[PDB]
Symmetry: C2
Subunit: 68 residues, 2 copies
Amino acid sequence: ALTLAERQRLIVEGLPHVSATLARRLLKHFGSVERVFTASVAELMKVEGIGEKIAKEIRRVITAPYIE
Amino acid sequence: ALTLAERQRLIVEGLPHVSATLARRLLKHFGSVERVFTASVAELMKVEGIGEKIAKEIRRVITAPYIE
């Protein structure tokens, strides 16, 4: 079954523009799934591979209302 | 390309013991991925379908430090 680390990576990989490599980088940078998902645009931009465009697309998915 | 809603569900479905059905319930209740990911165990339990066991498991995965 999924190890904790694998599950953490798969959750973060659900973000747009985020590959396995960027997911690992994000998790190592911020330290937990919660911290990756609460990081501001400016904080995300400090991560290699993430510019203003990607940072905002990531924040959009995280902060957008869920509409069915 | 995944739609915003599909991605939101995908991310939440990455949580332990959370099916597509429960993912939708969580998103409809909290409104956004960020709110689901910052909800305390007690808050997660307000969702019908989320018991103590599941809530604790969800929170553990979300807040656990990332280590390989």
